[PDB]
Design a protein around this ligand. Structure first.
Ligand SMILES: [Cl-]
Length: 155
């Protein structure tokens, strides 16, 4: 009854193995392993912010030679407004609940926050993996710069 999709020595693999939120602004570590000779080394990482993924998506959709191609959708902007607001209300209510109840609700809201964080990391990673598997878009020079250039694209 085994039913397995097998991957053997893939040429280009991109993941986001770690991410940082600081006052709800996210820095994604974008990590590439590749056997392709078009990259400057076989394994490397860069830091990216959401705005950089939007730059990349916009650059690809504005490339007229890609009119016949399907560009994968941009990841959505991280949004922690919900759990953050609940945290602010909770903190204000600390005096009104037992220490036990507070600590339980605190850990629950932290779990909420983490779930939002994981989902956005998913939105961002899937986008890059969809690009990597496209036989044309994976070769795109702007996609390469996005993966390889270890400086802050925004500033
Ligand atoms: Cl952000």
């Amino acid at each position: 009854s085994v039913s397995v999709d097998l991957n053997v020595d893939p040429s280009l693999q991109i993941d986001i193995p770690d991410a940082l939120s600081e006052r709800d602004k996210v820095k994604f570590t974008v990590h590439t392993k590749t056997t392709l000779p078009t990259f400057q080394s076989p394994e490397f990482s860069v830091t990216r912010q959401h705005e950089d993924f939007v730059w990349l998506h916009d650059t690809l959709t504005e490339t007229t030679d890609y009119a016949g191609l399907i560009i994968p959708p941009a990841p959505t902007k991280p949004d922690f407004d919900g759990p953050r607001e609940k945290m602010q209300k909770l903190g204000e209510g600390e005096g009104s609940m037992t220490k036990e109840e507070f600590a339980k609700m605190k850990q629950e809201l932290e779990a909420e926050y983490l779930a939002v964080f994981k989902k956005t990391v998913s939105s961002h990673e899937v986008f890059l993996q969809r690009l990597s598997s496209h036989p044309v878009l994976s070769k795109d020079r702007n996609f390469h710069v996005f993966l390889e250039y270890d400086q802050d694209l925004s500033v």
